[PDB]
Amino acid sequence: GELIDAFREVCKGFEQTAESVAVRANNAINDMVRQKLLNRFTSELADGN
Amino acid sequence: FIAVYQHLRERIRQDIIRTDDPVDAIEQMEIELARLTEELTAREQKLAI
Amino acid sequence: IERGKFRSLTLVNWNGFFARTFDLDELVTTLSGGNGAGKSTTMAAFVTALIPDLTLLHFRNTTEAGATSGSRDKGLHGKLRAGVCYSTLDVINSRHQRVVVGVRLQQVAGRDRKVDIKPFMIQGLPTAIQPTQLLTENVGERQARVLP
Amino acid sequence: RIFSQRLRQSVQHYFDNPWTLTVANAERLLDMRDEELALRNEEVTGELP
Amino acid sequence: SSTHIEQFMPVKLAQALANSLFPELDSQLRAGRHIGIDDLDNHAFLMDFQEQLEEFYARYNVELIRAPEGFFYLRPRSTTLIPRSVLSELDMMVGKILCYLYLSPERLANQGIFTSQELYEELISLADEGKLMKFVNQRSSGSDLDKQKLQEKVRTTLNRLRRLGMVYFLPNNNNKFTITEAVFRFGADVRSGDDPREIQLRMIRDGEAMPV
Amino acid sequence: FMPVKLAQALANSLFPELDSQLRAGRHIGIDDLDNHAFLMDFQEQLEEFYARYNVELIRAPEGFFYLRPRSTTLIPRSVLSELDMMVGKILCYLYLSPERLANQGIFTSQELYEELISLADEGKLMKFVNQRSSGSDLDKQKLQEKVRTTLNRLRRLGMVYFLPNNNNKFTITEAVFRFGADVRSGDDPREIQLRMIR
Numbered sequence: 165g166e167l168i169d170a171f172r173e174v175c176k177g178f179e180q181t182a183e184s185v186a187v188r189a190n191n192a193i194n195d196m197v198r199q200k201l202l203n204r205f206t207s208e209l210a211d212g213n
Numbered sequence: 214f215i216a217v218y219q220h221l222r223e224r225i226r227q228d229i230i231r232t233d234d235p236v237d238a239i240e241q242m243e244i245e246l247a248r249l250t251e252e253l254t255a256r257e258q259k260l261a262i
Numbered sequence: 263i264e265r266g267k268f269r270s271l272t273l274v275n276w277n278g279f280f281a282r283t284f285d286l287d288e289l290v291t292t293l294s295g296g297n298g299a300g301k302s303t304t305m306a307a308f309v310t311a312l313i314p315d316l317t318l319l320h321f322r323n324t325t326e327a328g329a330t331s332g333s334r335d336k337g338l339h340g341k342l343r344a345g346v347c348y349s350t351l352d353v354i355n356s357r358h359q360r361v362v363v364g365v366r367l368q369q370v371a372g373r374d375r376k377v378d379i380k381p382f383m384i385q386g387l388p389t390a391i392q393p394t395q396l397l398t399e400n401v402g403e404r405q406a407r408v409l410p
Numbered sequence: 411r412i413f414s415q416r417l418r419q420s421v422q423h424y425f426d427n428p429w430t431l432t433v434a435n436a437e438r439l440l441d442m443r444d445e446e447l448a449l450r451n452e453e454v455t456g457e458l459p
Numbered sequence: 460s461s462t463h464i465e466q467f468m469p470v471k472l473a474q475a476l477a478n479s480l481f482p483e484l485d486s487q488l489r490a491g492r493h494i495g496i497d498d499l500d501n502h503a504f505l506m507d508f509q510e511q512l513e514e515f516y517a518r519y520n521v522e523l524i525r526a527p528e529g530f531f532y533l534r535p536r537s538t539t540l541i542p543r544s545v546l547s548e549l550d551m552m553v554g555k556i557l558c559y560l561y562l563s564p565e566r567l568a569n570q571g572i573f574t575s576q577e578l579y580e581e582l583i584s585l586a587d588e589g590k591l592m593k594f595v596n597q598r599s600s601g602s603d604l605d606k607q608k609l610q611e612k613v614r615t616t617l618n619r620l621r622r623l624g625m626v627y628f629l630p631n632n633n634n635k636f637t638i639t640e641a642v643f644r645f646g647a648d649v650r651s652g653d654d655p656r657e658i659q660l661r662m663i664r665d666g667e668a669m670p671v
Numbered sequence: 672f673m674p675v676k677l678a679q680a681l682a683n684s685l686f687p688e689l690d691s692q693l694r695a696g697r698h699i700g701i702d703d704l705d706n707h708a709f710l711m712d713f714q715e716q717l718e719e720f721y722a723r724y725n726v727e728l729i730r731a732p733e734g735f736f737y738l739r740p741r742s743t744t745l746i747p748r749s750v751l752s753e754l755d756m757m758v759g760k761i762l763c764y765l766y767l768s769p770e771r772l773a774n775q776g777i778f779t780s781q782e783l784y785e786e787l788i789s790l791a792d793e794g795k796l797m798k799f800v801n802q803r804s805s806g807s808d809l810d811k812q813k814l815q816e817k818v819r820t821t822l823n824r825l826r827r828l829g830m831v832y833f834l835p836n837n838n839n840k841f842t843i844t845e846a847v848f849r850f851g852a853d854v855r856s857g858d859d860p861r862e863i864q865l866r867m868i869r
């Protein structure tokens with residue numbers, strides 16, 4: 165959620181459409197993970213967060 | 214004969230009876246039968262009272 | 263204990279009746295008149311008022327009695343005229359309470375000869391009010407109108 | 411220890427030979443769409459008995 | 460003599476069709492519902508007149524079939540009078556997992572009551588999570604929005620299986636449900652320890668299953 | 672037990688097929704010689720048979736048979752699209768008097784297309800395609816497509832019979848009257864049909 169809020173600020177700073185921002189943010193997050201820029205930890209203990 | 218066996222092999226019911234050998238399965242089935250008979254006897258005794 | 267009784271039956275804008283009220287008797291009430299006068303129609307209105315279940319209602323001729331026919335037409339629609347219609351009963355409770363039960367009937371526009379029903383109930387109505395007058399408005403020189 | 415291997419390997423490798431079961435799927439009864447109910451209003455009048 | 464039921468129909472078949480249970484059952488069966496041991500009324504009925512029903516439905520070019528596990532269902536022929544349809548691959552994933560759950564003695568202590576979350580956890584434990592996510596979305600890469608979408612698709616397909624009679628929800632709680640033996644049809648490709656290709660060929664020949 | 676004539680009726684070889692059709696909602700007209708005769712012969716018992724399903728077997732005054740589900744129907748129900756009814760009403764209008772001289776009972780898809788377009792209001796048209804659509808080629812194309820689709824649906828209903836060739840030319844059956852208006856003493860069918868269409 166915090167990463168999505170950060171992406172929203174960038175998009176605002178680039179004056180972009182607020183449509184599908186949650187999707188655009190997920191695409192960007194997945195792209196960063198796919199490009200080895202971010203490490204993602206999926207724990208059963210964190211209820212899937 | 215082979216065909217017969219093949220035919221039969223599919224027809225097994227559940228895991229505790231998964232002896233892939235039909236003939237072997239027979240006895241297991243019968244065991245079940247006896248088990249069931251005892252349960253029925255107890256249940257009908259309960260029903261009477 | 264004093265058993266309850268049906269006081270009267272009222273019909274509005276039925277086939278042949280504009281606004282008519284029959285006062286029932288304590289024991290027996292008889293309807294007479296030549297063929298086609300409207301006796302069976304009065305029976306049907308009463309029953310309708312009693313059990314508005316449209317699924318059930320099926321008014322066969324007296325001939326063909328007892329034959330389960332599934333007829334295309336239940337025979338109620340034709341007994342109603344265009345516009346709004348009513349059928350109501352006045353009852354005296356064992357408690358000596360006056361209660362007015364009834365239904366609002368109305369034909370449905372469309373090829374299928376369907377009918378609409380809306381039940382209602384009235385409690386505490388003064389004894390001096392007649393249903394015939396309660397359900398109509400006096401418009402013009404003694405040329406009353408029915409009201410929805 | 412018969413079905414563990416038998417079924418787990420099937421789920422693990424399903425996509426190498428994806429298959430689907432058949433079911434009876436009888437047609438639904440087509441009905442008229444109910445149009446908005448249109449009653450007959452005529453403001454009937456008459457002489458009172 | 461003339462005007463005698465036997466001229467046109469066996470007495471037992473007419474007796475069955477006249478029963479008060481028949482219309483319900485017929486309607487359901489045609490819709491694809493499987494019948495297990497728990498719905499006594501129906502099951503018992505089926506048992507009593509099995510051969511008459513089979514013979515009856517035969518008129519339609521459809522087989523009334525009895526699996527070894529004791530559950531009845533309808534299998535249409537190629538010339539069927541009644542349409543035939545196939546399940547989706549996600550339905551299969553949930554089906555094979557429900558099957559393993561039924562067998563699992565480790566969870567038998569629950570008395571059959573399982574939760575959608577437990578099903579989901581078992582599924583992701585066995586199948587390739589990230590590759591399976593491809594069916595939810597072509598760009599899925601483990602994002603939580605996509606994980607919630609997967610969970611909702613599962614909830615949906617499960618609801619469809621419920622309608623097929625493969626699973627029963629609790630009377631007051633919808634997050635929990637109980638299994639039935641009808642799920643064993645998802646194991647039809649492995650119940651015999653033989654060559655998978657030959658099994659698959661046999662199944663398609665019998666009309667049990669189609670490829671994609 | 673079971674009534675003898677009912678057992679006879681459902682023992683007949685034609686029953687399974689007709690059952691299948693009926694349950695689908697198909698209407699049986701005078702065209703289907705054997706099916707129509709079968710229903711005429713065994714109506715009294717088939718009505719009772721289908722009442723067990725909370726479904727009504729009705730013979731229209733024009734002559735065609737069909738099933739009507741109750742609220743409590745044992746058969747899963749389905750409902751038509753607005754566009755569907757639109758088209759249906761159209762076909763009912765085309766069952767006209769000059770039709771005989773105009774087409775000798777055989778129409779084309781274009782007749783219906785153009786009639787639809789000409790007689791309907793723009794707004795409802797839009798509502799049929801998408802509310803954001805506006806008088807565009809693509810829109811018209813999609814509308815055409817939908818028309819074809821719905822027409823096929825109707826053919827399943829038995830309303831319209833396609834002539835046996837790949838081209839889209841058809842004839843209208845009497846059962847289309849189910850779409851039609853209420854008729855009152857002396858009223859002109861053209862006028863009342865148009866009045867509902869409007």
Ligand SMILES: Nc1ncnc2c1ncn2[C@@H]1O[C@H](COP(=O)(O)OP(=O)(O)OP(=O)(O)O)[C@@H](O)[C@H]1O
Binds near residue numbers: 297304
């Ligand atoms: N559904 C209907 N549609 C049209 N006309 C109807 C309908 N039901 C009754 N009528 C007519 O209404 C009039 C009253 O009929 P009704 O049966 O009430 O009379 P009746 O006095 O009870 O006659 P009988 O004693 O012969 O039964 C008759 O002309 C009858 O033809």
Ligand SMILES: [Mg+2]
Binds near residue numbers: 298300301302303
């Ligand atoms: Mg009469």
